[PDB]
Amino acid sequence: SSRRKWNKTGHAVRAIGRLSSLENVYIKADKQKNGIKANFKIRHNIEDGGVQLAYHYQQNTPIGDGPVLLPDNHYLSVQSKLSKDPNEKRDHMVLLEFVTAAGITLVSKGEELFTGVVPILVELDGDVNGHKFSVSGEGEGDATYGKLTLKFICTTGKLPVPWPTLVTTLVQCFSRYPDHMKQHDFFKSAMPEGYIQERTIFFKDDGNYKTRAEVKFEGDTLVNRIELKGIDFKEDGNILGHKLEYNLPDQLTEEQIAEFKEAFSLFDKDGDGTITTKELGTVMRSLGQNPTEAELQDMINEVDADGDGTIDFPEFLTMMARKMKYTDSEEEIREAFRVFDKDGNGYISAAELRHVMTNLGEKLTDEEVDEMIREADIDGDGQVNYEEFVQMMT
Ligand SMILES: [Ca+2]
Ligand SMILES: [Ca+2]
Ligand SMILES: [Ca+2]
Ligand SMILES: [Ca+2]
């Protein structure tokens, strides 16, 4: 009951953390190559706790000479679910994805090829620190909903890396672009002749992959053929040591939605179901920071699916769900901690916790504060240190 207001305030601080990071797939025109480039960061949960980050840089250039659509800057937003087929004995992965374009606030000939369900084949040959492997995958895509359903088999036996590290490499032409962004869909404009997709992926504190793929129609089927080379991986790191989680629970208790609704209400001060730049600004000032109008617009734009310039309740819930599913880096948890630890000493005092509360919404004269400190205070000093904070928040 005072643990309830940690959750509330914790979620709010986590929401502001989210709105200040860059989590989507960022796309920009590359006129020199008549294509596009992208960059983004992927988070892979480490089974025993922590996150393995994978930084991606990407380049796409058309295989043919027809004109292609070169986009304004925007992003793709991906939801992925990995599972296992219980009748499959081979090393494998079942993958369901939804991908939508956004990032531009309120139609090519190649888009015609994607109006129904299109079969897909994927073939990958890889070599990571000398361990070679192959993967084949098959399924279908339905661009109308930005949807993909595929099964992948390692045809060479055991995969020497974790399956989740290969998801990005294993057909963005299946993304759903909304009506007002059709002119930014490079991927389908290149079809049917297709495009070359190249990446380098840096796994932090570890090795990297370098990939080259050809994505084109062969007959009625959209085919993605890839080579991958990985080097400099550590034999006891998260990749070659198989320490990454396969299965993230797409949980969402009704309890969790209710707790997100509670944090949503700190931002949504007029109770209209949507967070405006004025509301988000109010909250951020009240926490000390002092952002311009432009920054507030960019923050909202990072999670604003419909492009209306506001974060509505369901867009907030989606954002909070992804933020809880994927582990934060140590730097990010430290930033959250700093919002409470105003003086920087490494310890949240009854006083510091009050300031943050007063300033954020809650009325709470000294008594309920004390109970909050006590609830989180493992070592008994009457203060909350980092490690106690980290435990409070899981
Ligand atoms: Ca509002
Ligand atoms: Ca919106
Ligand atoms: Ca302090
Ligand atoms: Ca303590």
Swiss-Prot record:
Entry's Gene Ontology BP terms: bioluminescence; generation of precursor metabolites and energy
Uses in biotechnology: Green fluorescent protein has been engineered to produce a vast number of variously colored mutants, fusion proteins, and biosensors. Further generation of mutants led to more stable proteins (at 37 degrees Celsius for example) with brighter fluorescence and longer fluorescence lifetimes.
Keywords in alphabetical order: Chromophore, Luminescence, Photoprotein
Classification via InterPro entries: GFP, GFP-related, Green_fluorescent_prot
Known outcome of mutating K182R: In Topaz; shifts the major emission and exitation peak up to 20 nm
Mutation effect (K37Q): In R10-3; matures to the red-emitting state with excitation and emission maxima at 555 and 585 nm, respectively
UniProt superkingdom: Eukaryota
Record note on what altering F202S does: In alphaGFP/cycle 3 GFP; improves folding at 37 degrees Celsius, reduces aggregation at high concentrations, and increases the diffusibility of the protein inside cells
Disulfide feature: none
Result for mutant: N24K: Increases fluorescence at warmer temperatures such as 37 degrees Celsius. In Esmerald; leads to brighter fluorescence. In VisGreen; leads to brighter fluorescence
Mutagenesis / variant outcome for changing I42V: In P9; increases fluorescence at 475 nm excitation. In R10-3; matures to the red-emitting state with excitation and emission maxima at 555 and 585 nm, respectively
Effect in UniProt of substituting S175A: Increases fluorescence at warmer temperatures such as 37 degrees Celsius. In GFPmut 3; highly fluorescent mutant when excited at 488 nm
Phenotype when changing I42T: In P11; increases fluorescence at 475 nm excitation and at warmer temperatures such as 37 degrees Celsius. In Esmerald; leads to brighter fluorescence. In VisGreen; leads to brighter fluorescence
Result when mutating Y145N: In EBFP1.2; shifts the excitation and emission spectra to shorter wavelengths and increases quantum yields compared to BFP
Assembly and interaction partners: Monomer.
Assigned protein family: Belongs to the GFP family.
UniProt name for this protein: Green fluorescent protein
